[PDB]
Amino acid sequence: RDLLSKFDGLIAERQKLLDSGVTDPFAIVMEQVKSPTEAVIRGKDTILLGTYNYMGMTFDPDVIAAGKEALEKFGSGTNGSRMLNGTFHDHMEVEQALRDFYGTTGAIVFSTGYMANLGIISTLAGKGEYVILDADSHASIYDGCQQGNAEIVRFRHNSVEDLDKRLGRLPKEPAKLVVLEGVYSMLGDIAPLKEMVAVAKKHGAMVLVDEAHSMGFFGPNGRGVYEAQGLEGQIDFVVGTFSKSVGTVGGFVVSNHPKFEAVRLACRPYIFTASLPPSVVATATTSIRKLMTAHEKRERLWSNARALHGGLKAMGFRLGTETCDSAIVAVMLEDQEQAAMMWQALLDGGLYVNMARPPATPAGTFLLRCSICAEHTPAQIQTVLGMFQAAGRAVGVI
Template structure:
């Protein structure tokens, strides 16, 4: 028996995807031309699937800060935060993030994935119960597993179902609710205000992952909780640097007076090398830009409205209301793969999202907007989606 036999079905599905053309899960970017364009397969391609929401990957101040930090502090820390990897910049970024988020304390992690592992497995333990939205990101699922807590899933974005499940939970247990602000596959937002009311009713704790909503939602860009005016009811905030902040890393923040005990109680924090000086420096620069430039949020929302309206006018079914993510529903996996390949041939890169990584078996073309997209680029993209429509009609009648 081969140790990889357990993946035979997945490997078979991947082989069929390869028969249709380019591997959508291993696209090679030959050259980055800007925050919104790249050379892929010898073709100038508009990037519409990068999560570069504020378009800051080429921000000159962030680049200069990154280069200066690498020259000053080296390319890596070679140690965890509790060993030799606790640099001044890590702590300075934590203070700046805490101030921006209006939280008492903040911890910085090496990746956004690790942030969820560390926060969930640090906050919850084997004697606790986690109530998790069923559409949660893989890092949330893995953090729950690592915690050893009892895990109860509730229906996606359904406060009433959460209420019923919490009502059946025994007294005396610590109950942690975990939801996301913006769900990155379909692009829908959580009813956080309603979840907060359920949390208070049952004396639970609430953790919100604002990875895809930071910088985009809220008057100051703190996320969906700010936009829905319920930040005070959110006990723990998790986020990443790899979306709006255009770097790599993650964070957790809270007002709890004992929150910093996670620095010596959360294993993913304790035993992972700390973020590189370059990543921290660029994240700090991008945070300042995000906090002080509301035009970035205005630009991405204008682009989102333009793309969503155009796609619907062309007859596409978009999974959620206008926002930084536009997920287009297609009838089956074969159609989605063919559509993805055709778009790439037309010079537009989007994400192919198929089961098991999608809710309820959905097959999607996932687009993500950027503040750096020019209106003319959005119009060009819509023109290519119009050409895709013709290709899909020909495919359906073949």
């Protein structure tokens, strides 16, 4: 045995999945991507319904032009830390775009969303302090807790009551960070932020909200679930990513706290990595600024989401949410075999959705996840519904 012997179980599990005759759902290659909604997968034209490209920004002509210009003018990379040689014109641009987007004085960009959560959580809360998080928080939030030296307190999934009880049992004096998400990505349901934030404040805690799955399409300014629920000016830190609505890679944290900039002085995942390529921060800047006034896209996205959610529910699918509360629609299935057969029938028929990842999914839960795009046409949505009807009936789900 050696260091890789520990993976023998996972290897056997993947082979067991493949023994069923399905395409490996975790090795899909997009050979060509024609648009935000169309790709070629396994030599077949396929509608994309599992890409989390909520506002279709990845093919926006202004976004693409900004990226090409940045490559030409500034080259392919910075090769350095933001603290040394890695801050170019476009890095200053992208941080100001975020300040303008969120109405904050502070904005710190990280090289990935994962690293923003890893770094902000492990840097803000130290030894003798507390991080209080939802039991089903994103992996990056859990990894930030592991990276730090704080006391970690999980509360039962989606319970305002359990947050309140768990917070209330902690000592009063030490500083505390409550970490919440606006939209939770497994089922696409929304957090009761208004109520949870009131509880956090009662107990003197600071609040961090991850708005990765809401940017550009929740709240009057598209700032997130917290804005939609009336919490403008009440959230200490908002963490987000460039890899959803914005359409590239990178992470960020925004805040009005007067000492917020000091995070750059301490945060290891900010300091000890190369800054993003000029093209990446240029595309992000342009996308973020367009997202401030992308009203037609926002309306199309929600229209499409309501149509898909309403249609699948009407057909008899069991969904992760009773009402259409985000741009994620989760279809719940009875076993791994049913999920596999459904996913394959959809793929073979020309539709890509996500199969739940075993590392992300609790045992005994089986689903497919759909993500709506502002650039889906009403026609594509009806085509998708017809494909779900055909596959669902053929597999015996409905």
